[PDB]
Write a protein that binds this ligand. Structure first.
Ligand code: CLA
Ligand code: CLA
Ligand code: CLA
Ligand code: CLA
Ligand code: CLA
Ligand SMILES: CCCCCCCCCCCC(=O)OC\C(C#C[C@@]12O[C@]1(C)C[C@@H](O)CC2(C)C)=C/C=C/C(C)=C/C=C/C=C(C)/C=C/C=C(\C)C=C=C1C(C)(C)C[C@H](OC(C)=O)C[C@@]1(C)O
Ligand SMILES: CC(=O)O[C@H]1CC(C)(C)C(=C=C/C(C)=C/C=C/C(C)=C/C=C/C=C(C)/C=C/C=C(\C)C(=O)C[C@@]23O[C@]2(C)C[C@@H](O)CC3(C)C)[C@](C)(O)C1
Ligand code: KC2
Ligand code: KC2
Ligand code: KC2
Ligand SMILES: CC1=C(C#C/C(C)=C/C=C/C(C)=C/C=C/C=C(C)/C=C/C=C(C)/C=C/[C@@]23O[C@]2(C)C[C@@H](O)CC3(C)C)C(C)(C)C[C@H](O)C1
Lengths: 193, 179, 183, 47, 194
């Protein structure tokens, strides 16, 4: 089984797969590749969101202006939750468009992950190889090539750390949002966020 | 990291990296660090020399920054942040746009890119137009590269000293209280 | 357990177009199987003609809202109203020129039986290639597939612009701004 | 307009009544599309 | 790419062909020759256009009358903005200017029998139209090395000139495009013939 040959197994659940409900046992291998790809994407998005939400909760913002009328401090004033609503529309559209470009270019790689490729290994240069499209070759992950200095075992341990941190952030960001929605649901969040 | 330039006699003839930042760096990461260090050295040297020349009562440019908008170089202020604020927004925009065109040209026009097997922080587009170091020996060129890195790091320290003196009222000992 | 299913739809049988040497034939998208009834070469000729017309038309539609011929009579950013506003003689001359072009390009080949009698005639190959992109045979498949797909997207897009202007009464990007405006 | 997510909330909570007695049969049969005269007359296409 | 032996690779793009979208790989060598000829024509026309635009803005004009029938003079045309001068030219004057340009174009296509699209075309070469290019023999003194340098200078100046003419013609109509705040002359960015 493909579920028996991954890095996500951790001692926190013993030296064994954590599939309480047998979801991985009730699906074919292709769905397991999709699961790992989506798990890592969710984890990474979640930790980006978690650190961003903490930064917003601390009222930390850049010195300058997010538009020609709004200030970074002004749009951050209300809090992290309403900050996205207070962001100008064109900026939201631009973030969504660049995320669209990223998740289209990464999807359009033919080894893929569902059809015979490493799940979670986003192609480091999504926009390369596209005919009649040009990008500056800023490779998406490790643009300055930190992981090159690591050995294979080192980066395997760090992939395990990635899975652990991504799952923890998956919990954490939703903890932030749920604490904002239901007051006292997550007692660690003050009224500031 | 041990084969790169920048080390001098002032640190035991050895590398200065207390916090291990070079141990997590491959060849490409080290090239990026060197490119960033050199570009910061260049920018900081120009910045600190300009700030010193302006705020030290040095000569200013002759006439009008904007003949139409009515801003003389003397009336700009002879104070760094205040002068930059008083510069017209169009002037700042075209300075930054020219620098951006230069940066894009630098990235796209220096073949073997510094992050793909090229020399870090070299710009054949902008260096020695006339003749200056197109004929020097390969040991004096290395010596002057080391000098560049050294006094460039000193310029980084100096320009951030000026910035701290401006923001924090009196943070630098031997700098005025109105930087 | 379909023996020869459509590539686009595995739950439908292979149409005649799928087992064909046309550009884009490796898609098998024909739920109504109109390739069986319609001659495939005629249908591809019409496909490329409509795609070319509509991929001119979409650019014309989007750029007529913004730009005008200097001092042209009866301009209106809404092209639907601008058709009536503009002189009828302009549209008459345009239709006459296009009639001349179609007649001369399809001389004695205006019908299913008449056209494609000669084997060398290819669908859409009316000989229009001044810059000679087709002499480079490596990129010919790319350009043919690209023509087909962009023409299809342009047919759909022109329908979108036309019916959006019908809905709103305002030109395309004005309606787009009104959609992407404040609540 | 209100793009859901961009310039407005996404899913919005619904308005609800906190419990209540059983509506009488004639209360909703007289408004149903199939067992009401006005319901039948309103259960027609439009254009 | 196919645009490797072609001259045009500059000092500002390393010394490699700048074809980010790979249009030179598209199509035939005939297509690339058409692209080169169009590049050089746009170059040359842009140099002429910027020089004429500077002439119009400066107000230097020929002494006399454009047409004694309509009474329009070079001075009256000079009073308008540079793009409005074309509208101010007499209609027959525009017609015969376009006739001269069309005749030159037709002879360039016709009398230069080894065609730019055809094999051995020399796409930039319009000399062959005798006494059209360099009537004074100024280029005769030069050799192959200086001729190649001057061809590269032509290409660079012309690319810059077409960017420049687009910039000046779009600056006033599109405010804030070119950052330099100066009263660029008014008028349309595009004009029709006649
Ligand atoms: C833009 C800033 C910058 C950058 C990118 C670098 C980069 C580099 N320096 Mg450093 N350096 C700098 C500023 C910088 N320096 C300044 C201002 C000084 C003067 C104190 C020095 C003094 C110095 C010495 C004496 C030596 C180096 C060396 C190096 C190289 C190896 C160490 C390393 O990985 O550093 C990476 C550094 C960074 C990524 C910057 C991190 C900044 C932190 C997060 C905050 C700084 C704290 C505070 C605000 C100040 C590398 C090319 C060594 C070398 O040349 O080896 C061949 C070496 O021996 N540097
Ligand atoms: C980081 C670089 C930097 C920056 C941001 C500025 C910014 C400024 N300088 Mg400049 N200046 C610089 C470096 C810089 N300078 C250097 C290295 C020198 C040599 C000492 C000068 C000498 C100088 C003078 C004499 C004057 C200014 C002045 C000004 C102001 C108007 C713009 C101008 O004339 O720029 C010109 C910038 C350059 C010529 C530097 C180009 C550096 C390389 C070649 C690129 C503005 C606040 C005016 C002033 O004092 O206002 C109060 C003024 O009259 N600067
Ligand atoms: C083109 C306009 C547009 C844009 C730019 C966005 C953008 C967004 N919507 Mg969406 N949304 C739209 C139209 C749009 N929406 C429409 C028309 C509907 C009605 C069906 C929705 C219904 C909707 C809901 C119910 C929610 C969002 C949310 C969001 C945000 C979360 C992003 C996400 O999870 O994407 C996921 C998208 C995909 C996986 C791809 C689906 C689309 C492709 C083209 C197929 C994001 C800012 C969420 C929000 O409010 O977050 C704060 C949210 O809960 N949207
Ligand atoms: C319309 C004028 C025009 C034309 C026809 C060409 C043609 C050419 N250029 Mg280009 N070039 C131009 C303007 C033009 N250039 C401008 C203004 C610049 C910027 C200063 C450059 C800078 C440049 C460089 C640096 C190089 C070339 C080169 C080339 C050749 C190979 C690329 C190719 O196939 O492009 C084909 C392109 C077209 C047919 C034009 C398409 C235009 C689109 C549809 C609209 C653009 C709108 C714009 C964004 C506003 C080819 C002969 C290379 C060369 O000479 O190699 C030896 C080369 O290295 N060009
Ligand atoms: C050095 C000269 C120069 C400078 C400084 C500017 C400055 C400006 N121009 Mg530009 N412009 C120039 C030359 C220049 N122009 C020329 C020669 C032309 C004629 C061809 C134009 C034509 C022009 C137009 C038509 C417009 C501008 C506009 C602008 C603004 C652009 C701001 C921006 O988004 O930056 C860009 C900054 C970047 C970092 C992006 C560069 C990297 C690439 C593009 C990212 C990849 C894109 C990808 C799709 C994602 C600014 C005032 C706009 C305006 O009016 O704003 C008020 C505008 O609409 N300019
Ligand atoms: C400037 C130059 C650019 C360089 C940048 C480098 C860069 O960014 O590198 C990016 C990078 C890297 C790197 C390296 O390549 C480097 C540099 C070198 C190389 O050798 C190694 C690697 C690694 C490859 C990684 C980044 C990972 C990130 C961001 C992970 C982020 C992860 C956030 C989480 C988990 C948040 C969790 C929140 C939680 C749990 C919230 C919560 C709570 C509390 C409220 C707190 C308490 C509460 O408790 C109660 C209530 O009781 C419980 C809970 C759940 O409610
Ligand atoms: C940064 C910012 O904000 O603004 C900037 C940028 C921005 C916007 C682009 C601007 C612009 C416009 C620009 C830069 C326009 C550039 C125009 C340009 C570059 C125009 C070339 C004309 C050349 C001609 C007519 C040459 C004929 C030459 C001929 C016919 C010869 O006979 C040459 C000759 O060699 C032969 C063949 C033989 C020799 O024996 C003799 C000589 C040597 C004579 C601004 C506003 O200005 C400034
Ligand atoms: C990672 C995502 C992202 C990318 C990759 C990206 C790239 C580029 C590029 C280059 C490709 C250009 C040339 C460009 C230009 C502008 N961006 Mg933009 N941008 C991103 C995100 C945001 C956000 C969140 C905002 C924003 C904005 C602006 C404004 C301000 C206009 C103003 O002063 O009103 C201008 C001119 C703000 C906005 O929309 O303001 C209404 C705003 O909030 N951007 N942006
Ligand atoms: C290194 C950067 C740089 C470059 C490479 C560069 C090149 C050119 C070129 C040639 C290519 C021309 C033709 C040109 C023309 C004008 N420049 Mg410009 N310029 C640069 C920087 C600045 C700054 C800082 C200012 C400035 C200005 C003006 C004015 C306004 C005059 C007035 O309004 O009186 C005019 C006409 C001032 C301004 O716009 O002030 C509101 C102003 O402060 N420039 N500039
Ligand atoms: C390509 C350049 C060019 C060439 C090679 C060329 C040659 C000749 C020849 C020899 C073969 C003759 C005999 C001739 C005669 C006249 N030219 Mg003419 N001409 C050129 C350009 C212009 C322009 C720009 C204008 C113009 C005009 C007139 C008028 C005035 C008529 C009048 O009073 O209206 C007369 C009599 C003006 C015009 O047509 O005004 C309506 C006007 O504006 N021409 N022109
Ligand atoms: C497959 C393929 C391609 C493709 C494709 C693509 C992208 C195709 C896209 C097709 C697409 C996008 C098709 C939309 C149809 C929309 C319709 C019919 C809307 C009707 C809408 C109606 C009838 C609205 C009616 C009303 O408003 C009225 C009048 C008043 C209101 O009171 C009530 C409502 C709101 C109901 C390539 C990539 C281009 C090439 C390749 O080779 C082959």
């Amino acid at each position: 089984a493909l579920v028996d040959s991954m890095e996500g197994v951790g001692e926190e659940t013993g030296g064994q797969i954590w599939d309480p409900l047998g979801i991985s046992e009730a699906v074919s291998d292709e769905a397991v590749m999709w699961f790992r790809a989506s798990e890592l994407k969710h984890g990474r998005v979640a930790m980006l969101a978690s650190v961003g939400y903490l930064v917003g909760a601390a009222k930390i913002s850049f010195p300058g202006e997010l538009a020609k009328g709004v200030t970074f401090a002004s749009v951050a004033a209300n809090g992290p939750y309403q900050a996205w609503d207070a962001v100008p529309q064109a900026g939201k559209l631009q973030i969504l468009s660049i995320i669209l470009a990223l998740e289209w270019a990464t999807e359009a790689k033919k080894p893929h992950y569902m059809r015979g490729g490493v799940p979670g290994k986003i192609e480091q240069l999504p926009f390369d190889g596209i005919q009649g499209l040009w990008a500056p070759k800023i490779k998406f992950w490790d643009p300055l090539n930190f992981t090159g200095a690591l050995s294979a075992e080192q980066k395997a341990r760090k992939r395990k750390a990635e899975l652990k941190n991504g799952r923890l952030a998956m919990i954490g960001i939703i903890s932030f949002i749920t604490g904002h929605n239901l007051p006292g649901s997550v007692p660690a969040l003050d009224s500031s966020f | 990291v041990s084969d790169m330039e920048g080390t001098g006699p002032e640190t035991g003839g050895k590398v200065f990296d207390p916090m291990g930042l070079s141990k997590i760096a491959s060849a490409e990461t080290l090239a990026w660090y060197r490119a960033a260090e050199l570009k910061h050295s260049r920018v900081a040297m120009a910045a600190v020399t300009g700030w010193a020349w302006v705020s030290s009562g040095g000569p200013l440019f002759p006439g009008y920054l904007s003949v139409e908008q009515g801003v003389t170089f003397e009336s700009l202020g002879r104070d760094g942040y205040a002068a930059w604020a008083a510069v017209p927004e169009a002037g700042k925009f075209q300075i930054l746009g020219v620098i951006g065109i230069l940066e894009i040209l630098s990235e796209s026009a220096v073949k073997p890119h510094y992050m793909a097997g090229g020399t870090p922080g070299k710009v054949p587009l902008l260096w020695d137009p006339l003749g200056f170091t197109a004929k020097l020996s390969p040991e004096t060129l290395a010596r002057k590269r080391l000098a560049e890195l050294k006094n460039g790091r000193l310029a980084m320290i100096g320009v951030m000293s000026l910035v701290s003196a401006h923001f924090i009222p009196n943070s630098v000992p031997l700098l005025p209280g109105s930087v | 357990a379909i023996s020869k299913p459509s590539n686009a739809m595995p739950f439908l049988t292979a149409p005649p177009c799928q087992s064909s040497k046309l550009p884009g034939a490796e898609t098998g998208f024909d739920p109504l199987y109109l390739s069986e009834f319609i001659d495939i070469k005629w249908a591809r000729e019409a496909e490329l003609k409509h795609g070319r017309i509509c991929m001119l038309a979409t650019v014309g539609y989007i750029m007529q809202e913004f730009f005008s011929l200097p001092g042209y009579p009866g301009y209106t950013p809404n092209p639907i109203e601008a058709v009536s506003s503009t002189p009828p003689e302009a549209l008459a001359q345009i239709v006459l020129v296009l009639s001349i072009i179609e007649f001369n390009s399809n001389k004695d080949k205006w019908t299913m039986d008449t056209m494609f009698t000669d084997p060398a005639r290819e669908p859409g190959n009316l000989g229009f290639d001044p810059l000679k992109f087709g002499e480079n045979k490596e990129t010919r498949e790319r350009l043919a597939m690209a023509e087909l797909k962009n023409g299809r997207l342009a047919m759909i897009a022109f329908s979108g612009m036309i019916h959006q202007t019908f809905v709103t009464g305002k030109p395309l990007f004005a309606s787009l701004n009104d959609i992407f405006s404040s609540p | 307009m209100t793009i859901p997510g961009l310039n407005a909330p996404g899913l919005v909570p619904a308005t609800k009544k906190p419990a209540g007695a059983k509506p009488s049969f004639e209360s909703y049969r007289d408004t149903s599309h199939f067992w009401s005269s006005q319901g039948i007359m309103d259960s027609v296409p439009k254009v | 790419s196919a645009a490797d032996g072609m001259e045009g690779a500059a000092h500002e793009t390393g010394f490699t062909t700048w074809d980010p979208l790979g249009l030179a790989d598209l199509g035939s060598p005939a297509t690339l020759a058409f692209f080169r000829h169009a590049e050089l024509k746009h170059c040359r026309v842009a140099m002429a256009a910027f020089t004429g635009w500077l002439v119009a803005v400066s107000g230097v004009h020929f002494p006399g009358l454009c047409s004694f029938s309509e009474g329009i003079s070079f001075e009256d045309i000079s009073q308008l903005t540079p793009m409005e001068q074309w509208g101010a030219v007499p209609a027959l004057g525009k017609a015969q200017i376009l006739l001269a340009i069309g005749i030159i174009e037709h002879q360039s296509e016709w009398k230069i029998k080894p065609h730019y699209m055809a094999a051995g075309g020399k796409p930039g070469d319009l000399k062959g139209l005798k006494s059209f290019w360099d009537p004074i023999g100024l280029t005769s003194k030069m050799d192959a090395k200086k001729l190649e340098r001057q061809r590269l200078s032509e290409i660079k100046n012309g690319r810059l000139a077409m960017i420049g003419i687009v910039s000046v013609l779009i600056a006033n109509n599109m405010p804030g495009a070119i950052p330099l705040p100066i009263a660029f002359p008014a008028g349309p960015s595009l004009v029709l013939p006649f």
